[PDB]
Amino acid sequence: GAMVMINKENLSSQAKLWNFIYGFADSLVLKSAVQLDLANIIHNHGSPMTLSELSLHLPSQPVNQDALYRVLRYLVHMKLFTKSSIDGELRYGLAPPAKFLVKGWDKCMLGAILTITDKDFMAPWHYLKEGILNDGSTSTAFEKALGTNIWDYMAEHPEKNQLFNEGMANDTRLIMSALVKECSSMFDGITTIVDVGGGTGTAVRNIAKAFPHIKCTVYDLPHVIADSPGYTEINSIQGDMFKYIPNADAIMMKCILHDWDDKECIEILKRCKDAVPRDGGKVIIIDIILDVKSEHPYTKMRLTLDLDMMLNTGGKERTEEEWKKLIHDAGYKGYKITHISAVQSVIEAYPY
Amino acid sequence: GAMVMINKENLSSQAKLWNFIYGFADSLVLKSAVQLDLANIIHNHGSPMTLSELSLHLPSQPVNQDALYRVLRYLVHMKLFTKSSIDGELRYGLAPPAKFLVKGWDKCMLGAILTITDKDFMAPWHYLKEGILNDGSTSTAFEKALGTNIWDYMAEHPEKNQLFNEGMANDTRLIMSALVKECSSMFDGITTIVDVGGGTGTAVRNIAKAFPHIKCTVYDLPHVIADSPGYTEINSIQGDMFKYIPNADAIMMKCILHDWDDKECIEILKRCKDAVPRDGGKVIIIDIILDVKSEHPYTKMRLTLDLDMMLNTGGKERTEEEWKKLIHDAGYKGYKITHISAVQSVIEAYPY
Ligand SMILES: Nc1ncnc2c1ncn2[C@@H]1O[C@H](CSCC[C@H](N)C(=O)O)[C@@H](O)[C@H]1O
Ligand SMILES: Nc1ncnc2c1ncn2[C@@H]1O[C@H](CSCC[C@H](N)C(=O)O)[C@@H](O)[C@H]1O
Ligand SMILES: [K+]
């Protein structure tokens, strides 16, 4: 026969499944709280607010207060918001992790939330089964869901292009402080730096501010340079990194190589290696290093980004051994990793 | 000025946000594992299986083993699956909560996973902001997303109707054992019972099996009775519960009243009250009781179902005080709650 349960049906176990099943409700209630701007209304107010006070300051009128109350109840249970009785009224405040929903500082995560929880950008995740049972198609889930590869898609959907670029801009804002402070020594002796696939320029604008004697260049596809603010002292160049990388003292690539498979990464890395000087040239790779032996705060989300790449770009997240092999195969002399308390780490690859 | 951070940026805190942001990845990787049938392949095998062995038994060929490996890595990190080295090979097994992904027992949750993580059925959650900032429309998010109210939608989409009905069938299978065993005394002295909105009949088929002397009736809308198997000894009746409830010794309503607002619930409850005898008649309500004072294993998912109802049906989940007021207002004498270690509880409402 088969297992016969006779006692003791375990509730915690079943609740864990329900919680995974409804994982999307956490993503999409969070999206709503962001769109309603609840955290900033409260933070600007400076004290907990009643339901009525909150309603008066929402993005539009009128407001369904029953719905607002129910969403706030869910948000309090997430431990993002608080509810308490103060001078005989129920008032809503912020819990410590809501600080990342508050505008006006480098760790505000709003742009990234709005990109990642976008309905069209979530669609490829519905094609995960088809990424394993391919039926002879080599297209990405992104292409299956949205018509074509991610980069050509952005070239043909300017609003999507801008939403994605601002998500990556936000991701970059999260790490720049640690980067320029903890890793200042990496920028010593550099006169020129090109941020390859540098997006709408958050990384170069920050490096250029911190290191006023380095001539900075941002390089990306035309449709991304087109969605970028004008430049004065920073060179803005458009092109295809598979065909050309602008020569400089250093090259940086943040969230680039995780987009591409091994053979492509080797082609990109070889191109960067030949763009930097034999005498102190370096390539600064900023991407996730997956630890598959121990658990860290960002482990869960790094494994998520592995599948995110599998579905959206055709890339992957890499363990240290995997990075080592890639850098070896591109013909570099060695590498050095620097952790910066972020999702991504810094990997310097030294061609000589 | 504003807060200036000077030290100590907290990683756990930021990871909690990332994990909420990517909550949907848990839902949609789980969906993929269900579609690939990984848990049942392994359970039927009876021991952990290598990646190669697994691939040979998947629903279709060929198989992208790199993708399969990466999805399994995520699934192991969820603690649904296991990975270990056995006789010099990496082999994949089941962790304890994967038992709910294994077919052939009443607590298999597969049908519910496939309904809840359906792409169309997830769509209304993208309209949560519009449920608070209504802009003068009284439509549900379900209607905004999919065109019309949930029940008419099912009447016009037979495949969706069948997927939803089987999700509710699964939900019912999860509780029937506890129901008929823990609550047998509720069925004493009953000669007839009508399951109002009884779906495709899982509840009545189970009650009819456990209590062979009770004449059971399932009652639902025509498009649901049409998606139901034929009946012999169980009456199958179609209609509109707002206009008619078949008279019987007892009426049961599982996952009904949570679909409707207060005024509608009162109209439904009054109709049931007048359908049962003055002498020992009872109405058996099976729905969530929300505890808003303490935390339980299913609290998180119950709050999720509150929003689920808000978005999909126009209903809500209710606290005991809320159930008390509703039952009082429908003119019942009293109520009694019985917990059955499930998402829903049992609430008997006694009209006299
Ligand atoms: N062939 C190519 N040449 C140059 N840039 C490219 C490219 N293919 C993709 N990219 C760019 O690579 C970037 C990946 S997203 C990373 C953006 C930025 N470095 C950041 O971390 O915030 C996108 O901006 C995309 O337009
Ligand atoms: N006016 C009406 N009359 C009868 N049934 C209705 C109805 N409006 C909705 N329903 C039904 O109410 C059910 C809600 S879902 C609950 C199904 C079942 N009792 C279960 O718990 O598994 C659906 O089957 C839906 O078709
Ligand atoms: K979705």
Ligand SMILES: [K+]
């Ligand atoms: K567009």
Ligand SMILES: [K+]
């Ligand atoms: K259909």
Ligand code: NA
């Ligand atoms: Na309130």
Ligand code: NA
């Ligand atoms: Na890690």
Ligand code: NA
């Ligand atoms: Na393996």
Ligand code: NA
């Ligand atoms: Na509860």
